[PDB]
DNA sequence: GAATCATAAC
């Protein structure tokens, strides 16, 4: 198949779709995550094309901080009255091209959370905190990630609120109800 | 049987 039409390039299309955009400025766009992993799940993307955190340098430091600020503004404007906790961050090994910041509520109440990979990609070191990535670019000048990230996606399910271990996705979903 | 697992998508 074509490069432009490959599944991995899908964010490049969505980020230009008015129906998916929730905020735009001179630097970034915010879209709804197409397969959200919680009640509120947005992606913040710069207009400028940066393939992934591997291509990030200090020239992009203001941009990463702006993406974070914009993420926090979307939370306030769209979910401020909700009592929800949010995290902002990056997958250590993304699947989709074009750097994108995840802005995600911590209920994890969603039909798109279907497997252990989904869970662990938001609930282990595989989810790099936005602030951590920002600080690493500032102090080290580039983003590095340790070996062994794929193995994290296979860890036993553990609740992010109370650390209880759960034997299955259905049982995890039932358990998470208690933390609403 | 329900759920998970790895694999496959030409
Ligand atoms: N066309 C699309 N528009 C918006 N979000 C998408 C699209 N395709 C995939 N996604 C989401 O993009 C994220 C890609 O994951 P990752 O590359 O691991 O950061 C996931 O949260 C997907 O649900
Ligand atoms: K199995
Ligand atoms: Na992947
Ligand atoms: Zn719990």
Report on this model:
The chain has 180 residues and is an alpha+beta fold. The protein has helices at residues 10-14, 61-79, 116-123, 130-140, 149-152, 169-176; strands at 21-24, 28-32, 41-46, 86-91, 101-105, 127-129. Strand 1 and strand 2 form a beta hairpin. The radius of gyration is 16 Å and the shape is globular. The structure holds adenosine monophosphate, potassium ion, sodium ion and zinc ion. Residues 159, 161-162, 164, 175, 179 line the site of zinc ion. The structure holds one DNA strand of 10 nucleotides. It is classed as dna binding protein/rna/dna. Keywords: protein-DNA complex, DNA repair, 5'-DNA end processing, Histidine Triad domain, HIT domain, Zinc finger, 5'-DNA end recognition, DNA BINDING PROTEIN-RNA-DNA complex. The entry is titled "Human Aprataxin (Aptx) AOA1 variant K197Q bound to RNA-DNA, AMP, and Zn - product complex". The protein is Aprataxin.
So, the CATH homologous superfamily? HIT-like
SSE string, helix = H, strand = E?
HEEEHEEHEHHH
Major pleated sheet: 6 strands, antiparallel
Shape: globular
Distance between the termini: 44 Å
- Count every beta strand, where a strand is a DSSP E run of 2 or more residues: 6
Rg (CA only): 16 Å
Percent of residues in helices? 25-40%
Task: Name the CATH class.
Answer: Alpha Beta
Bound molecules: adenosine monophosphate, potassium ion, sodium ion, zinc ion
In spatial order, strands of the major sheet run 1-2-3-5-4-6
Question: How much of the polypeptide forms β-strand, as a percent range?
Answer: 15-25%
Q: Indicate the CATH architecture.
A: 2-Layer Sandwich
Alpha-beta content class: alpha+beta
Number of helical elements: 6
Q: Domain count, please report it.
A: 1
């Amino acid at each position: 198949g074509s490069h432009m039409g490959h599944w991995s390039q899908g964010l490049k299309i969505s980020m230009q779709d008015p129906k998916m955009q929730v905020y735009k400025d001179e630097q970034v766009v915010v879209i709804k995550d197409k397969y959200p992993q919680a009640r509120y799940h947005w992606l913040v993307l710069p207009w400028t094309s940066i393939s992934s955190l591997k291509a990030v340098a200090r020239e992009h430091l203001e941009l990463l901080k702006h993406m974070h600020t914009v993420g926090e503004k979307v939370i306030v404007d769209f979910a401020g009255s909700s009592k929800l906790r949010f995290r902002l961050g990056y997958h250590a090994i993304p699947s989709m091209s074009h750097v994108h910041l995840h802005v995600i509520s911590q209920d994890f109440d969603s039909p798109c959370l279907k497997n252990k990979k989904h869970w662990n990609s938001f609930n282990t070191e595989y989810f790099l905190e936005s602030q951590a990535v920002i600080e690493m670019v500032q102090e080290a000048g580039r983003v590095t990630v340790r070996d062994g990230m794929p193995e994290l996606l296979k860890l036993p399910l553990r609740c992010h609120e109370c650390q209880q271990l759960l034997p299955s996705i259905p049982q995890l979903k039932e358990h998470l109800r208690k933390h609403w």
